[PDB]
Write an enzyme that holds these catalytic residues in place. Structure first.
Site, short mmCIF file in Angstrom:
data_model
loop_
_atom_site.label_atom_id
_atom_site.label_comp_id
_atom_site.label_asym_id
_atom_site.label_seq_id
_atom_site.Cartn_x
_atom_site.Cartn_y
_atom_site.Cartn_z
N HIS A 68 0.84 -1.24 0.00
CA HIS A 68 0.00 0.00 0.00
C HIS A 68 0.86 1.27 0.00
O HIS A 68 0.79 2.09 0.91
CB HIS A 68 -1.01 -0.02 1.13
CG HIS A 68 -2.09 -1.02 0.97
ND1 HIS A 68 -2.06 -2.23 1.61
CD2 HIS A 68 -3.21 -1.02 0.21
CE1 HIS A 68 -3.14 -2.91 1.30
NE2 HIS A 68 -3.88 -2.19 0.45
N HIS A 72 1.52 1.59 -5.77
CA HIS A 72 0.10 1.14 -5.81
C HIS A 72 -0.79 2.31 -6.24
O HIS A 72 -1.66 2.13 -7.14
CB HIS A 72 -0.31 0.55 -4.46
CG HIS A 72 -1.77 0.29 -4.40
ND1 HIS A 72 -2.36 -0.73 -5.13
CD2 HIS A 72 -2.75 0.84 -3.67
CE1 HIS A 72 -3.66 -0.78 -4.83
NE2 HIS A 72 -3.93 0.16 -3.96
N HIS A 106 -6.11 7.39 -3.02
CA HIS A 106 -7.14 6.53 -2.37
C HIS A 106 -6.56 5.78 -1.17
O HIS A 106 -7.37 5.29 -0.36
CB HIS A 106 -7.82 5.58 -3.33
CG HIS A 106 -7.00 4.38 -3.61
ND1 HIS A 106 -5.90 4.41 -4.44
CD2 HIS A 106 -7.10 3.12 -3.17
CE1 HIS A 106 -5.37 3.19 -4.49
NE2 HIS A 106 -6.05 2.40 -3.70
N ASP A 107 -5.24 5.66 -1.05
CA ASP A 107 -4.64 4.90 0.09
C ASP A 107 -3.64 5.80 0.87
O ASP A 107 -2.80 5.26 1.60
CB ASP A 107 -3.99 3.62 -0.43
CG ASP A 107 -4.89 2.38 -0.46
OD1 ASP A 107 -5.78 2.22 0.42
OD2 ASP A 107 -4.60 1.52 -1.30
N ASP A 217 -8.56 -0.68 -8.07
CA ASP A 217 -7.86 -1.08 -6.82
C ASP A 217 -7.31 -2.50 -6.91
O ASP A 217 -6.25 -2.76 -6.24
CB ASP A 217 -8.76 -0.95 -5.62
CG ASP A 217 -8.00 -0.85 -4.32
OD1 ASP A 217 -6.78 -0.51 -4.36
OD2 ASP A 217 -8.65 -1.07 -3.29
N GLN A 269 -5.94 -17.72 -3.21
CA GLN A 269 -6.03 -16.89 -4.45
C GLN A 269 -7.24 -17.32 -5.31
O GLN A 269 -8.01 -16.42 -5.75
CB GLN A 269 -4.68 -16.91 -5.18
CG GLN A 269 -3.60 -16.06 -4.49
CD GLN A 269 -3.85 -14.58 -4.62
OE1 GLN A 269 -4.03 -14.04 -5.71
NE2 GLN A 269 -3.96 -13.89 -3.49
#
Ligand SMILES: O=C(Nc1ccn2nc(-c3ccccc3)nc2c1)c1ccnc(Cl)c1Cl
Ligand SMILES: [Mg+2]
Ligand SMILES: [Zn+2]
Length: 313
Positions: A68, A72, A106-107, A217, A269
């Site tokens: 993050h 990213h 956004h992060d 995202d 996953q």
């Protein structure tokens, strides 16, 4: 005014594709973003000097965590660029402005821990924001940086246009809380299937932008296999540190976050592709047909994780 950003030929061509990887040269990421704003929005959207000062303060407010991080942020903004460029006429001038900025921001100031970890730790942010804890913080940090001197990239908008773009950014950032994605996509699925989806309805646009934010995202799963696989290492490096910190609070973490259970990663996953990623890109492709390459790339990566389980790698 007459000053375009231009990229080397390989990047100029490949940045247009959904699966573009922004590369390991951090000093080129600001230029890549400005390039994308200029083609997505216009050379007049933002005062170059303000935009440059804003990008560099946003960079400074991302932390040196495994996943993050600043890479990213730019990666998620590039997926939004690819969606907007393949859907020229569906979006307003304010949406084009707000959405690349929302994605870059956004992060902001992420620490590498989930909303759940903040709540179990009893972090101050979990008392200030009882749901979407980190995402309300990310929006708080976006407004802080917009208010720094010389950082108001929206300064030419009217009072009501400024309020509208900050409302686009707030909803877009809150939508990146994956807890909210499941119900958002179910409502979009029902609306599309009963034919009630209406892009002139603001509550409908909001939902569709939410799903775009989820799609950008998660875009690590839509890259070529060697990018996807190496990025998964950074994702799990964070999850396993969170698991370690859960153990320090005397809580067995979920298996996803327990480094003693690395062997179950491939099955984990598959669940994520099947329960989150594939449904996300499927509903996105139904609403915005030219985003089909994201679904196709995701399906290719699902098939690569199936091969890992079969010991073919
Ligand atoms: O990897 C992600 N999610 C997930 C979601 C559920 N599980 N469960 C496991 C698991 C379960 C049991 C044992 C071992 C592992 N591993 C996961 C990873 C992810 C999260 C946010 N952003 C992106 Cl692009 C991705 Cl790809
Ligand atoms: Mg987030
Ligand atoms: Zn993110």
């Amino acid at each position: 005014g007459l000053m375009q950003f231009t990229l080397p030929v390989r990047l100029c061509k490949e940045i247009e594709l959904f699966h573009f990887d922004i590369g390991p040269f951090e000093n080129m990421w600001p230029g890549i973003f400005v390039y994308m704003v200029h083609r997505s929005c216009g050379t007049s959207c933002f005062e170059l000097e303000k935009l440059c000062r804003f990008i560099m303060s946003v960079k400074k407010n991302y932390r040196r965590v495994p996943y993050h991080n600043w890479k990213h942020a730019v990666t998620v903004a590039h997926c939004m660029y690819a969606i907007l460029q393949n859907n020229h006429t569906l979006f307003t001038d304010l949406e084009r402005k707000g959405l690349l900025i929302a994605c870059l921001c956004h992060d902001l100031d992420h620490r590498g821990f989930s909303n759940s970890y903040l709540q179990k730790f009893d972090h101050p942010l979990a008392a200030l924001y009882s749901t979407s804890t980190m995402e309300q913080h990310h929006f708080s940090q976006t407004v802080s940086i917009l208010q720094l001197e010389g950082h108001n990239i929206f300064s030419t908008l009217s009072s009501s246009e400024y309020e509208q773009v900050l409302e686009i950014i707030r909803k877009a950032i809150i939508a990146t809380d994956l807890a909210l994605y499941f119900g958002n996509r179910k409502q979009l699925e029902e609306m599309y299937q009963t034919g009630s989806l209406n892009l002139n309805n603001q509550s409908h646009r909001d939902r569709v932008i939410g799903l775009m934010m989820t799609a950008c995202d998660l875009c690590s799963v839509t890259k070529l296999w060697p990018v996807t696989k190496l990025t998964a290492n950074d994702i799990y490096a964070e999850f396993w540190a969170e698991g370690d910190e859960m153990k320090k609070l005397g809580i067995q973490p979920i298996p996803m976050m327990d480094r003693d259970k690395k062997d179950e990663v491939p099955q984990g996953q598959l669940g994520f592709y099947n329960a989150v990623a594939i449904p996300c890109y499927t509903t996105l492709t139904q609403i915005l047909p030219p985003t089909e390459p994201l679904l196709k790339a995701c399906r290719d990566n699902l098939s690569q994780w199936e091969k890992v389980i079969r010991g073919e790698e």
